[PDB]
Every structure is written in C-alpha cells, then in structure tokens.
Amino acid sequence: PLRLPVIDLSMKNLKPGTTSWNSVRTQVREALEEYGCFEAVIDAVSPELQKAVCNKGHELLNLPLETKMLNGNKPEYDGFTSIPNLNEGMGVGRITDLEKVERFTNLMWPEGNKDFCETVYSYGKRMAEVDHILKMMVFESFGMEKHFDSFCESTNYLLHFMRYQQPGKDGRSPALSLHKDKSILTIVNQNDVKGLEFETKDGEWILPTADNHIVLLGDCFMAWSNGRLHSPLHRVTLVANQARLSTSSFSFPKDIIETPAELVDEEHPLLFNPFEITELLAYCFTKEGAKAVCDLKQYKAYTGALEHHHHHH
C-alpha cells in the first residue's frame, strides 16, 4: 500500500544550522520533488488550539448564507461557496493581519466574537511560521538563499475551511473536484476524518489517514522552481458515512511569481513567464479558465518549452 513520505516537523527539529534541520530539509526537498506533498508531524499548534480552530470553522460555516456572502464574491480566495447536499466553505483572508481578522470577525458578528478572532489569528500566525521555515529549506536546497527574503516580502496568508456533509453511505463518495492548488504551500489538517487524495506522477492514488497534517506544493512554488518541484493533483473522496471539516493554510506571493534565471538551463528551459496570482486564481474559477485548474501549462504564462524529461539528447 502506497503512502506519502512522513516527515517530522516538530519544532525541536527546526533549529537552523543543526543536524536535524539539514536532514529534514533533505527530506522535504525529496518529497516535494517526487510526490509534491507529504504527511507532516507539526507541533507548532497545540492539540487544544487545533480543535478550537475546528470549532471556529463550524461556527463560521453555521452562519446564514447572506452573512457569509458579506465576505465577497471571490470564491477563488476567501468567498463562500457551496454545492447542494455536498460541501460548503469559505476563508478568512489575510489571516496574519490582525486588523483584517478583527474586521472580518466584526463583519460576521457585529456584536463581536473575541474568541473567534483570537483563535484563528493565533493559528494562522503559527502555521505561517511553519510555512516560512519550509520555504526557507526549499530555497536552501536549490542554493537560492540570496533570493529568499525578497520572495517572502508581504506574503499573503489564507485560512480556509471546507465542510462536507455526511455522504449517507459507506464506500467511496466523491466530495471535492480534482485540482492543483495555486498557493506556494498548503498545510492541511483533516480534523480526524480522511478524504484528501493525491495522484502520483505514475497515476497511482494515495489517500492518507488523518494521523498527521498534510503539506502540499502549489503551482506558485512549482513555477518558481521551473518545474523542478511537483505540484500534485488532489481531490477529496469520503470513505466513511461521516461529515468532514478541513482546516487549510495557504501562502500566496505578494503579487508576481517569476522563475529565477539560475533554475533555467539547457536541460530545463523556462516553462513559465511571470504571472500575477490574483489574475490566475480568478481565471481558474471561470468557465473558460477551467482548463488551468489542473494544469498551469494551460495558462497564458506557459512558454511552450519542453519539460526536463523531454530534453532531446
């Protein structure tokens, strides 16, 4: 039975310059190159905070439709969506900006909801720190430390909840459509109900248990790496008659993704011209842009150049 790599991201391993930092960095790079994702042991968020954030996700999604629609009409980022009798979700945009989180909380609860605001802000800050460390290891593995600070300037962080109602049957119940994330990195907590399912480069499907967190690569990091890393296709398939709520943390660039020239060579011609993230995400949620959801090569930034394995030699 296939399984994603399992990487120990406990804070005791994340001290830069140490032996454990180097061994984790090697495993992160290998996993994101081959699988594009891995199971992660993450202790930056206590179990108590993880369940509290889960409760806040339910509290938010329990709100009336018209209240949740106040968060805007951008489902590609934080806007509310739902499919009848199937799923629903929305996001808290810019979760690391306390002023925006306060504003969001008072928009949903005009009387105030201090417990909601403090909980989701504390969680978004802690997961952003894990995201920052993972990006730092990836940059080190490519020898691009000199570009790291500029790449992380004004990083946009998103906290997103998706809830899936009880499928009413055992066995496999498709619950979320196949896609690639357009993030830099995505960190997922399945809140003890599995369903997130990945395809491998070889066409095999891997459905992890809910034991650990899941870290996966988005198309922004893939494009930055000039295709040297893999952004994996993934979907949600319920495999039990029980409801599910996912807690996901996305990182996005300030605006523009550009492949460093150092990652372009003869065997790795430039795959993607620069592109802006908000434009790409909006396109993917249109009828005409559906083809880019599962393949960034369908987006206008694609150059038509051959992938590395197709280099003629």
Ligand X SMILES: COc1cc(C[C@@H]2C(=O)OC[C@H]2Cc2ccc3c(c2)OCO3)cc(OC)c1OC
Q: Decide if residue 76 touches Fe ion (CB under 5 A).
A: no
* Contact predicate 180/174, CB 8 Å: no
Contact partner at residue 160 from ligand X, Fe ion, none, CB < 5 to 8 Å by partner kind: ligand X
DSSP per residue, 237-287 = EE-SSS-EEEEEEEEE-SSEE---GGG--SSS---B--EEHHHHHHHHTSS
b/e burial code for range 71-110 (CB count within 10 A of at least 16 → b): beeebbbbbbebeeeebbbbbbbbbbeeeebeebbeebbe
179-218 binders of ligand X (CB under 6 A): 179, 181-183
Among 53, 162, 175, 188, the residue binding ligand X under the rule CB under 6 A is 162
Q: Is 179 annotated as a binding residue?
A: yes
DSSP 93-157: ESTT-HHHHHHHHHHH-TT--HHHHHHHHHHHHHHHHHHHHHHHHHHHHTT-GGGHHHHHTT-EE
Q: Does residue 21 touch ligand X according to CB under 6 A?
A: no
Q: Which does 284 bind (CB under 5 to 8 A by kind): Fe ion, ligand X, none?
A: ligand X
**Two tokens at 253?**
């660039």
Question: Residue 9 CA to chain centroid, in angstroms?
Answer: 17
Confirm or reject binding of residue 219 to Fe ion (CB under 5 A).
Answer: no
Binding to ligand X (CB under 6 A) within 24-53 occurs at: none
Residues 140-159, one symbol each (x = binds ligand X by CB under 6 A, - = not), give ------------------x-
Strand pairing report for 87-93 and 156-164: antiparallel
244 is an annotated ligand-binding site residue: yes
First-to-final CA distance of the chain:
36
- Binding track, positions 86-115, relative to ligand X; x by CB under 6 A: ---x--------------------------
Residues 284-313 within binding reach of ligand X (CB under 6 A):
284-285, 293
Using CB under 6 A as the binding rule, whether residue 75 contacts ligand X is answered as yes
Shortest distance (Å) from residue 293 CB to ligand X: 4
Which one of 78, 88, 131, 181 is in contact with Fe ion (CB under 5 A)?
Answer: 181
Any known ligand binding at 265? no
CB of 201 to ligand X, least distance (A): 20
Torsion of CA 240, 245, 247, 252, to 10 degrees: 90
Q: Which residues are annotated as a binding site for Fe cation?
A: 179, 181, 234
User: Where on the chain is the footprint of Fe ion (CB under 5 A)?
Assistant: 181
User: Where on the chain is the footprint of ligand X (CB under 6 A)?
Assistant: 75, 77, 81, 89, 158, 160, 162, 176-177, 179, 181-183, 250, 284-285, 293
Q: Which residues are annotated as a binding site for 2-oxoglutarate?
A: 244
